[PDB]
Amino acid sequence: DELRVRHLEEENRGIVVLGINRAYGKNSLSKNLIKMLSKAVDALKSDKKVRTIIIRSEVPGIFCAGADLKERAKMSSSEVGPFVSKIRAVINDIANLPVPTIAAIDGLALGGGLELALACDIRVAASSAKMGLVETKLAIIPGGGGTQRLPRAIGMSLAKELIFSARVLDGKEAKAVGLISHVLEQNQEGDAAYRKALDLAREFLPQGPVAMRVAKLAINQGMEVDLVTGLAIEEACYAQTIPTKDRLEGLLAFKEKRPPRYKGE
Amino acid sequence: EDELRVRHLEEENRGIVVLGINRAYGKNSLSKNLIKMLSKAVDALKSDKKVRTIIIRSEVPGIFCAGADLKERAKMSSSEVGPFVSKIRAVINDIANLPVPTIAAIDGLALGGGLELALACDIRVAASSAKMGLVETKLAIIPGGGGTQRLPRAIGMSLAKELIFSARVLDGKEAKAVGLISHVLEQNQEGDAAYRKALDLAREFLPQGPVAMRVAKLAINQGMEVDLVTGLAIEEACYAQTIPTKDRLEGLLAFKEKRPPRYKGE
Amino acid sequence: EDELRVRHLEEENRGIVVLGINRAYGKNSLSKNLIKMLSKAVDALKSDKKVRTIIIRSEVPGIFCAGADLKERAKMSSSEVGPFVSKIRAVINDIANLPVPTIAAIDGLALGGGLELALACDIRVAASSAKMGLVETKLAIIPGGGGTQRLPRAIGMSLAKELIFSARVLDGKEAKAVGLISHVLEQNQEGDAAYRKALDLAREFLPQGPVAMRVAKLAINQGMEVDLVTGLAIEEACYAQTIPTKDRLEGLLAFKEKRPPRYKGE
Amino acid sequence: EDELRVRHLEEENRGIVVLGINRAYGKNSLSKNLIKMLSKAVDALKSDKKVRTIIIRSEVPGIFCAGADLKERAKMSSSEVGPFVSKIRAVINDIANLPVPTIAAIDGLALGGGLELALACDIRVAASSAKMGLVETKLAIIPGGGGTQRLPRAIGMSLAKELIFSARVLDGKEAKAVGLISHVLEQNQEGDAAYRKALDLAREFLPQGPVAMRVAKLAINQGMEVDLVTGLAIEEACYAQTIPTKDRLEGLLAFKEKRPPRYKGE
Amino acid sequence: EDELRVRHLEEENRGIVVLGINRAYGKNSLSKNLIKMLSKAVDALKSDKKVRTIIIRSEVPGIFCAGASEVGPFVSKIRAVINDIANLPVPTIAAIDGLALGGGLELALACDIRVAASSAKMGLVETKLAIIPGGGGTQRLPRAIGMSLAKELIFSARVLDGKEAKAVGLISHVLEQNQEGDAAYRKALDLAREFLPQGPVAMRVAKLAINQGMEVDLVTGLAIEEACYAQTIPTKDRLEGLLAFKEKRPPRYKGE
Amino acid sequence: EDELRVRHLEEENRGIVVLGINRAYGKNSLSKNLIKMLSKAVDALKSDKKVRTIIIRSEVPGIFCAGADLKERAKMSSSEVGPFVSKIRAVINDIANLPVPTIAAIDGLALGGGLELALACDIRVAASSAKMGLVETKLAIIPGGGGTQRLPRAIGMSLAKELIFSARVLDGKEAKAVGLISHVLEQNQEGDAAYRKALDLAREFLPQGPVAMRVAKLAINQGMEVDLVTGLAIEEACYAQTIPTKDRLEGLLAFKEKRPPRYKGE
């Protein structure tokens, strides 16, 4: 129960929420939480109905504090490398989820915590939330992919400044450097970011499921190769939409001037 | 065929060429006829040795390019769609490879293939009231004119994903905020503030050495698709091409005699 | 020679090494001799194990670096141009590969090779009145010290092209708006406000684990030159360098005791 | 249906899993259903802790896999060919990425997609009378299951190009001669010579430490995708994974007590 | 001077184009004109859409092609033309019936396939001249026979005959020389004729997929294969292929 | 310590340096003291200007290098293992980066680190009776001295995987058969047949231009870790370095006076 997987219903049908529930250990990335997060992600990776995934915390004021420093203290040096690589690998699995992913940051997101959010496609946070990669202050470096993703998200100059200074930014500041896409004033219940994430996710729902997946594929893979190859990849992804019923439905709904009803095929 | 006009401006705008889309009835949609014409016009400019800057814009107020000609698309068999969309992607790419600076003047709606055509230009300027976006996913398809590649490279993966995922339309002001365009302007009563702004920016390019401008664009486009070590080698090669030119000497001579340089592109 | 001073700050700023260009008589231009000493200071700083942060600044008020020494360039023959320009490009790349955080304090004019030099630093700070840009095209050539590669990578292709195509010069305020610099502050009566902000920022880096800081810059720089999967493997190798260090343990100890860590760089 | 059999062996074969194609009516062609089943079996096996080696074979005499189901390829329209061929390319790539040692036992015909599947395994063994080749160019298409990529990497470009250009079918003896397979066997009365050799080979793998076998494969596969300097770092990270394992200690313990090691895969 | 003959075979070998070097008065050495013509001829074929296979041979018995601030520029010209040969759109075969040294062997290494008489000689002896292979040999040799053997050959500047070149994988086919001295060429034609029946569009993108895919990581190579495959999907030849297989007859491709 | 003898042959072998391992009591195992000496000797040789070829062999009959010292490893703390293994990997890598041609003469057992050290040499020669292989996986670890990277690069992914997975040992005959060594020969009464062939091969390198040999190895090693376009660029630079040498002219001059070249490495 430290990791809750909720498959929403009603107007939110198609939306899945991964909630970290370890208020006792500040939602830190323990061997067990990593184990379940990995199982959840692996299961979702091949889930039919899923149209959008939101990753958030069910603990007020905290998203994910990162590495379980208690455990790290007990860990012998020979065990540190392998464990941190396990974390790096699960976060990369999140980055490769087939559908749109949104991280709802309503609390502290440090180290692995921010790196996890960096693995999502879009980040939204409260203006009061705190985030940063403070690893160099501990004489280590971001090991969950941060040295790689932060720079690709906000440019090397800003990424280096944040990693070199181990600075902690608030929502407003994170928004200013583009670390996040939407900043929200926190509400009484403390789920303002989550609320924004749910709305954004509902804004994704009506789109063609196959098109959304191949679009994410084209963008993610396209950005890893040169432009010419990226264009060929786009062609291949576009080809996946051509023989779908949905594409036809899109046209039919247009002829009948009615809203499309996509099935994901 | 007058759906695409190519005007070689003169006098104060000598050097600037303008490609104007004129398909009001089709909302400047990318019909097969239009792509061929644009493809034909693009291939001619790739050889023109007088052009110093190209501006792409609309002749029809309120519209830039609504993208795909769906009515013509609805008549296309499944086996025709792929080849045709690729044709569009390839022509937009040829535009992206134009040898000289290109500017997209967005004074109206730029959707799908329209915005994609805009992304192929080096610089985009738009009216604050202009509307643009990639709505493909609402039709169970995806941007097919290079949009899944050029949007992320232009505004970053996170914003590109949100825009494509949501199939959201943005106005000039919102586009300036996410960095989709470089200049936003309040629309004028003629409905061509963006075009006027494009002309002003273009004239700002006219004075520089033609060869340098060409190799500079080549260095930037090619270098951004390889690693830095490779890109630096590309820069050295591009720089080498300006060394034995008459214009470089003219630049030092002009600087010596304290006077405006008058380059010839040689 | 007093053309380039290398001060290894003391006490409060122990670990900070300042590099100051001093050639007011030549606008700090990148002369044949100047890059020679620069290359010398860089090759040294590179192997220096005591440095934690390097700041590049000018000791000449109102001037950072005007670029290549134009007076000597006019005297250069066509065959000596390429080699020389390449030397500058290489030394600037050597600055881009310095082992520790580098900061460019711009309290004056930064043109051509001068701005390129600053682009080679991790972070750039400037006074609102500081001037900078790549004007090479107005001289029928192109930026040749890595500018056609580093500018687009820092501010994006569209903005980079516009600046190079128009050979536009910007002030600190504008540079900050396009993301060319990370920090902008109003100048002071001493004309060293940038140098001051740089020092303050540098001190912010000092408390961090020395080994971690080095492999972190290594991870970022090398990771951005390859695809993400390879990038992740590079992060893994860098991280592995901090695991067996005494500083790592001191980090966990200091966190536990609620006190400032005292890293020794091992 | 029962077209794909997944057999978890027992006794002196426990740890060995066998995936057997069983579609005699379609010459074990890669139909929509076989790919779906193949894909689910592979995905399941990827997270199976108990597996130490996987063998891919045919339970149909004289036939390994004829490749594409031409009865279906003729049925589907053009727009459906691309996505389907890519599906096959993807499932074959999933097989190449299985975490444990994989062996392809070729006791029959392996054409196009069939051979490509075999190329996805770590090791290939075949009967001297078995026939294999990528004859796609004779059908006016090219190997679509990864063959243009895996064949050249396995036997070199010159030989791969000759096989693909000529669309030649080789027997096990000739396949061995060009390095396409590692072991060639004289076929037996039951027609399972290749398989028998594959089983013996798999048994040679079983006694080794499971975690070590997995990271060894990871080090080799990924190390070959990057430059050597990066590959060595990946080796270190993979080696580091064996250090804190109980099996490594057992290895040492067994050496002192001078006896056969008994690994648990942890 | 007709130093380079471009024979456009027909009938039985229609689609095959032979490039014969004829300069026995220079042992087919790479001279200014040879390189200029050779280059001009490659540019011609490079864009020819009727050619299905190109064979590079020597019409001077016993010899294939010997070796070759001014030096550098001219060495890069040869390297550049050899690389252009490496980029020809259709299958290329090097028929080695004579001596192949320096740029000569590097020329053959730029072809897709190499055949040679067991008596023919070849090697990269630049080191004995205090210089190194400058026509790509240092890159293409290692990639063809492996690093260790490549280095041994270049470090020792050893010369090998067809029988040896075959055992180290330098060539794909070796054969006894005939009385006419064109056994290699004879094999090359036989091989080239083996390619002729295949779909022209598929053959070309297949070479593309292979050449380009080997220059990147496998995942990228897979995307390149997908794109190349896509080019064959809408072709009439693809349907002719299926048609021919159904009627159990030989395909008649048109390259479209 | 005489654990490692460095001989600078003279007369008919002048220009050849032999690094002979002599640690019979430990089976030439890679002890911490042995690598330091090895590292010391290798670092020294990379500075030597007279060396033209380096041969690595054993001064003990029947043994090349048994790899890791299990007695010194059994007393190794889990936290010491990683750094130590990495130290071996690094020293074997420095051997691979030796500027002059290297040859491994295997006249006996070459296991683990021993075979990996041999893999770092450009050329390997072995006696028919010499045994070699990477048996790490039988100890629940993996080749940690570059084996997972160099073996696949030397004999292909499929053969390397089988050998590492099965952890089997091959004799010289079989090693020759799979391409692991370049020359195999019958052992002689003294048990130094491999060493003899290595000498005969080394003397075959002596007569070539020192500078060319050095740049040939650089072009090939560095060229094989990048794409062909880059590799060809590297070749153009390595070639350029022999153009202005006194040796290049001596080659032409020697060829002029029809006499044997007498290079001096300049």
From Swiss-Prot, chains B, C, D, F:
The keyword Transmembrane helix does not apply. The lineage of its organism: Eukaryota, Metazoa, Chordata, Craniata, Vertebrata. Keywords: Acetylation, Branched-chain amino acid catabolism, Disease variant, Lyase, Mitochondrion, RNA-binding, Transit peptide. GO terms for molecular function: enoyl-CoA hydratase activity; itaconyl-CoA hydratase activity; methylglutaconyl-CoA hydratase activity; mRNA 3'-UTR binding. It is linked to 3-methylglutaconic aciduria 1: An inborn error of leucine metabolism. It leads to an autosomal recessive syndrome with variable clinical phenotype, ranging from delayed speech development to severe psychomotor retardation, coma, failure to thrive, metabolic acidosis and dystonia. The keyword Lyase applies. This is Methylglutaconyl-CoA hydratase, mitochondrial. Catalyzes the fifth step in the leucine degradation pathway, the reversible hydration of 3-methylglutaconyl-CoA (3-MG-CoA) to 3-hydroxy-3-methylglutaryl-CoA (HMG-CoA). Can catalyze the reverse reaction but at a much lower rate in vitro. HMG-CoA is then quickly degraded by another enzyme (such as HMG-CoA lyase) to give acetyl-CoA and acetoacetate. The chain holds residues 74 to 339 of 339 of the full protein. Residues 32-46 are annotated as: RNA-binding. It is found in: Mitochondrion. Pathway: Amino-acid degradation; L-leucine degradation; (S)-3-hydroxy-3-methylglutaryl-CoA from 3-isovaleryl-CoA: step 3/3. Its EC number is 4.2.1.18, 4.2.1.56. Changing residue 167 to V: In MGCA1; decreased methylglutaconyl-CoA hydratase activity. The modification N6-acetyllysine is found at residues 27, 40, 71, 131, 138. Belongs to the enoyl-CoA hydratase/isomerase family. Its main location: mitochondrion. One of its GO terms (cellular component) is mitochondrion. It comes from Homo sapiens. Homohexamer. The gene is AUH. The modification N6-succinyllysine is found at residues 27, 36, 40, 71, 75, 87, 131, 138, 256. It catalyses: (3S)-3-hydroxy-3-methylglutaryl-CoA = 3-methyl-(2E)-glutaconyl-CoA + H2O; (3S)-citramalyl-CoA = itaconyl-CoA + H2O; 3-hydroxyisovaleryl-CoA = 3-methylbut-2-enoyl-CoA + H2O; (S)-3-hydroxyglutaryl-CoA = (2E)-glutaconyl-CoA + H2O. GO terms for biological process: fatty acid beta-oxidation; L-leucine catabolic process.
Curated annotation (Swiss-Prot), chain E:
Keywords: Acetylation, Branched-chain amino acid catabolism, Disease variant, Lyase, Mitochondrion, RNA-binding, Transit peptide. The modification N6-acetyllysine is found at residues 27, 40, 121, 128. The modification N6-succinyllysine is found at residues 27, 36, 40, 77, 121, 128, 246. Its EC number is 4.2.1.18, 4.2.1.56. It is found in: Mitochondrion. Homohexamer. It is linked to 3-methylglutaconic aciduria 1: An inborn error of leucine metabolism. It leads to an autosomal recessive syndrome with variable clinical phenotype, ranging from delayed speech development to severe psychomotor retardation, coma, failure to thrive, metabolic acidosis and dystonia. Belongs to the enoyl-CoA hydratase/isomerase family. This is Methylglutaconyl-CoA hydratase, mitochondrial. The gene is AUH.
